[PDB]
Structure formats: C-alpha cells, structure tokens
C-alpha cells in the first residue's frame with residue numbers, strides 16, 4: 001500500500017519549497033491510489049505553534065493538496081503531532097537499549113556538560129536526584145547505503161559517525177529518531193522530501209536497521225533556489241504560499257509553476273495539476289535545484305486568468321477580494337462579467353485586476369495625482385468636460401462609433417489636442433491615466449455613468 005507524507009515543522013508559514021515537496025507527494029499518492037499523510041513535526045517547543053500549524057494546513061488546502069490522515073481529521077496511525085507522541089519515542093528508544101543497540105548516558109548535575117558514565121541499566125538513582133540522562137545510539141562498523149530515486153546510489157562509512165543521542169535529557173527525541181519511528185509506525189512506503197535532508201539519511205537507515213525494520217523508498221527533491229543558487233529566501237523576494245495568494249496568484253497557477261520548475265514538459269507549459277496527475281512520474285522531476293523566477297510565475301498566472309472561463313475568473317476574483325479584506329460591492333452580473341472580460345486582458349494578478357476593476361465597480365474611485373496635475377488643471381479642462389457631457393447626453397445610440405466620434409469632435413473643433421481630450425475623459429470616468437480601451441470603457445460604463453462621472457469630475461475641478 002502506497003503511503004507518503006508531508007512532515008512540516010510548524011515554525012512558520014508554508015514555504016513554496018514546502019508546497020512543491022507536498023505537491024509531488026500528493027500527486028504520487030493520488031496517481032498510485034495511495035494515501036497522503038500529514039505529520040506535524042512540532043517537537044521544537046520554542047519555535048512551533050498551533051498558529052503556524054493552522055497557517056500551514058490552510059495553505060496546503062488552498063494549494064489543493066488535501067490529505068488522507070492528519071492532526072485535524074485523524075486516522076489509524078496517529079497521533080499526528082510529534083509533540084503528542086513522546087511516550088512512543090520513549091518506548092521505542094527503550095527497545096533499543098534493551099536490545100543493546102543504545103545506552104543511557106548520565107551527566108553531572110552541577111555541571112551538565114560533564115559525562116559521568118554510560119550504562120544499559122536505567123539509572124534510577126541519578127534520575128531521582130536530578131541528573132541529566134540521555135540515550136545514545138551505538139553505531140556499528142560497516143557500510144550504510146541506499147538508492148535514492150533522484151540522487152542515485154548513496155554509500156556511507158559507519159566508522160565516520162560517533163555514537164549519537166536519540167533521546168534528549170528533557171524527554172524529547174532528536175529529529176532523526178522521531179522521523180524514523182514515525183515513518184515506520186505510520187507505515188510510510190515512500191519518503192519524498194527536500195534535498196536538505198539527504199545527509200540525515202544514513203543515520204536514519206542505521207536506526208531502521210537497529211530495529212530490524214525495512215526502510216522505505218527515498219527520494220530527495222532538489223531545493224527551490226534564488227537567482228544566486230542559494231535556497232530561496234526572503235532576500236530573494238516572496239517565499240510563502242500565503243504571500244503569492246495575497247498578491248493574487250491563482251492556486252492552480254502557482255501549482256502549475258511549482259510543477260513546471262525544471263521540467264521540460266512536453267506540450268503546453270500552461271497546465272493544471274489535475275490533468276498531469278495520471279501520467280505523473282517521480283523521475284520526470286529534475287535532479288538539480290530549480291531557480292524561482294517571479295516574473296515567469298506572474299506570466300503563468302496571466303495565462304490562466306485569460307484562459308479560464310470568465311465566471312471561473314469571477315469566482316477566483318470574488319474569493320480573493322474577500323480573503324484580502326476588500327470584497328467586491330454588489331453589482332449586475334452581466335456588467336460584472338463584461339468589465340472582467342475587458343479588464344483581464346491587461347493584468348496578470350488578481351490584485352492588479354482589483355485595481356483596474358475598482359473604478360468600474362465603485363463610483364467613489366479616486367483621481368490619480370498625475371491626472372489632476374497634468375490634465376484636470378489645464379485651462380481648457382473645464383470646457384472639454386462640459387462639451388463632452390453635452391454631446392454624450394445628446395447621443396441616442398451608445399455604440400463605439402458614436403463614442404469615438406464624440407471624442408474626435410472635441411479635438412477637431414479645437415477645444416484641446418487629441419491627447420488632452422483622451423486623457424481628460426479617461427481620468428474623468430476612471431480616475432486613471434492608464435486603462436483598457438477608452439471606447440470600450442465608455443461603452444460598458446454606459447451613458448448614465450458616463451454623464452454622472454463627467455459631472456462629478458467637473459464639480460471636483462471647481463474645488
């Protein structure tokens with residue numbers, strides 16, 4: 001039975017690298033008909049919190065990576081938080097001591113750094129007196145090897161590793177011990193994780209061997225890097241899923257990009273995880289690190305925004321806005337769709353879409369600084385707007401030809417240059433100097449809105 005896991009340490013937000021690691025596990029499980037387990041690795045009490053755990057679960061959900069077992073839904077191999085499994089680690093570390101593969105180390109009490117002696121017999125008298133006591137794993141001579149799905153055959157000389165602690169004096173396991181005990185007990189068949197854990201693998205294999213357990217199949221996924229080839233960090237730019245979500249990157253687009261990284265996909269670069277799920281093959285994954293390109297991500301997002309159904313885009317837009325704390329006012333559905341169809345040709349993120357959609361959705365839009373200073377303040381601004389209002393008002397047919405003629409007549413009759421006429425009207429009805437086609441904009445806004453806004457702009461000018 002195929003069982004994979006995403007085992008995040010909730011010490012912060014879900015990094016896109018983590019999302020990519022989770023994506024490949026999720027795709028392998030759904031394609032193979034297996035299970036995707038979510039294990040929270042929160043033994044670092046100081047840095048982990050339920051707030052971060054929750055933020056991570058929310059981000060995974062938003063990325064469309066639902067799990068079959070976890071801290072919230074449970075399952076038959078829990079608890080799913082390592083902080084809730086301290087007794088399990090204790091019992092299994094004890095099995096190793098009893099089998100002479102691990103031993104207790106007793107330290108001085110006044111000077112905790114001073115080792116007093118080692119023993120296979122639990123030192124009750126020292127424990128009761130407050131002496132620190134740890135458990136160390138006994139490294140056996142020999143070789144430790146495994147065939148990684150992406151990194152190939154790996155070999156390790158045991159002799160180069162000194163006996164190491166698996167249980168700390170505070171009662172908590174070390175990360176490597178907890179991971180092996182949990183991957184084993186949660187019956188994980190495949191461990192797909194970031195390459196930053198490749199070096200921890202020989203040690204983990206030694207523990208599996210000490211218990212007489214069969215180790216799962218391993219695959220270490222190269223990391224997502226910044227342009228200088230170091231792991232993607234804050235200094236490179238955004239790194240959390242939550243950030244891209246807030247900026248308006250569509251989930252399906254972010255996941256498309258994370259899968260696209262380093263993959264010379266055959267066919268369209270624009271795709272959904274869903275359609276690539278059936279032919280998913282772990283070996284298609286690049287064995288080299290991948291560089292995150294913010295510009296390319298935005299380009300991918302733009303492609304999705306224009307390709308999806310207008311109403312699909314509308315839902316994405318509405319939910320994003322609500323999530324961002326600035327939900328869309330209530331408007332006519334046809335009008336909503338029309339303005340969306342026009343505004344989406346020009347933007348690449350839901351946030352950029354929100355900015356240009358605002359004047360279409362609300363009458364209280366603000367006038368840009370440059371519009372007021374560069375155009376509205378000119379001497380001819382008033383008569384241009386008054387004449388525009390007069391001619392538009394007399395229009396009996398609100399089509400683009402008549403709208404175009406109305407603007408043409410304003411400059412040809414000498415009220416101002418063509419540029420000033422166009423910009424004065426554009427800013428008057430949107431408050432912006434850059435917008436989708438001016439005739440399309442006026443047409444969809446309608447006669448009444450156009451008149452109201454020209455009047456509104458005139459009153460504003462009068463200050």
Ligand SMILES: Nc1ncnc2c1ncn2[C@@H]1O[C@H](COS(=O)(=O)NC(=O)[C@@H](N)CCC(=O)O)[C@@H](O)[C@H]1O
Pocket residue numbers: 006007008009010015016017018019020021041179192193194195196197222223224225231232
């Ligand atoms: N820049 C990057 N690019 C691409 N992947 C990256 C990454 N940084 C971290 N990762 C990978 O994301 C997953 C979560 O990282 S994490 O929350 O710190 N947790 C841990 O590393 C450990 N708790 C995982 C232990 C295990 O799986 O055996 C881990 O699989 C981690 O290897």
